[PDB]
Amino acid sequence: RKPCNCTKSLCLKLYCDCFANGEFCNNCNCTNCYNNLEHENERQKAIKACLDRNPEAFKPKKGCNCKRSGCLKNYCECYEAKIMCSSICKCIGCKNFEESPERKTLMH
DNA sequence: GAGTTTGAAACT
DNA sequence: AGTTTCAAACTC
Ligand SMILES: [Zn+2]
Ligand SMILES: [Zn+2]
Ligand SMILES: [Zn+2]
Ligand SMILES: [Zn+2]
Ligand SMILES: [Zn+2]
Ligand SMILES: [Zn+2]
């Protein structure tokens, strides 16, 4: 959906949101893109290396480790997904919980 | 547009 | 676990 602007990763790593969502890049702004039909062999390699690192990498779709955002900035994957942090999050200084004032203020 | 900040993903 | 890399979020 939204264009990636990768240069260094070739869009063959999870730093690339297009590749992380199991898509070919389309109309993106990436450089040296391998996330496409023209690089099928090398792309397949990246996929399996990506997968044996974590077998759930491309599972149909746990917790943040934010230090400085307070989890009220879109650096927090919880906040970006517009959901609350949970017990599994290893946040520090988390202000992204139900009864949080700052969260409520930033909500309006 | 440039430069800084951030934390997941990667690497050692 | 500590460190580096990376592309996006953010700030100016
Ligand atoms: Zn990309
Ligand atoms: Zn892309
Ligand atoms: Zn790409
Ligand atoms: Zn967070
Ligand atoms: Zn969280
Ligand atoms: Zn949090």
Author numbering: 522 to 582, 597 to 643
Q: What is the paper's account of this structure, in its own sentences?
A:
The conserved MuvB complex acts as a switchable master cell cycle regulator, promoting expression of cell cycle genes during the cell cycle and maintaining repression of cell cycle genes during quiescence. LIN54 is responsible for directing MuvB binding to the cell cycle genes homology region (CHR) of target genes. The DNA-binding domain (DBD) of LIN54 contains two tandem cysteine-rich (CXC) domains that share sequence similarity with tesmin, a testis-specific metallothionein-like protein1920. We show that LIN54 uses both CXC domains to recognize the specific DNA consensus motif TTYRAA.
To understand how LIN54 recognizes CHR promoters and the molecular basis of our observed sequence specificity, we determined the crystal structure of LIN54 DBD bound to CHR13 at 2.4 Å resolution. The asymmetric unit contains two LIN54–DNA complexes that have nearly identical structures (C-α root-mean-squared deviation (RMSD)=0.33 Å; Supplementary Fig. 2). Consistent with our NMR data, the DBD contains two independently folded subdomains corresponding to DBD-N and DBD-C. Both subdomains contain a CXC fold, which we define based on structural similarity to the CXC domain from MSL2, followed by an α-helix that contributes to the subdomain structural core. Within the CXC fold, three Zn ions are coordinated by nine cysteines, which are present in loops and one short α-helix. Electron density corresponding to the 15 amino acids linking the subdomains is lacking and there are no observable protein–protein contacts between them, which suggests that the subdomains are connected through a flexible tether. The subdomains both bind to the minor groove of CHR13, both on one side of the DNA helix. DBD-C binds the 5′-TTT half of the motif, whereas DBD-N binds the 3′-GAA half. The protein–DNA complex is stabilized by an extensive set of backbone and sidechain hydrogen bonds to the DNA phosphate backbone and by insertion of a tyrosine from each subdomain into the minor groove. The most striking feature of the LIN54–DNA complex is the interaction of Tyr536 and Tyr610 with the minor groove, where those tyrosines bind both halves of the CHR consensus symmetrically. Tyr610 binds the TT step at the beginning of the CHR consensus, whereas Tyr536 binds the AA step at the end.
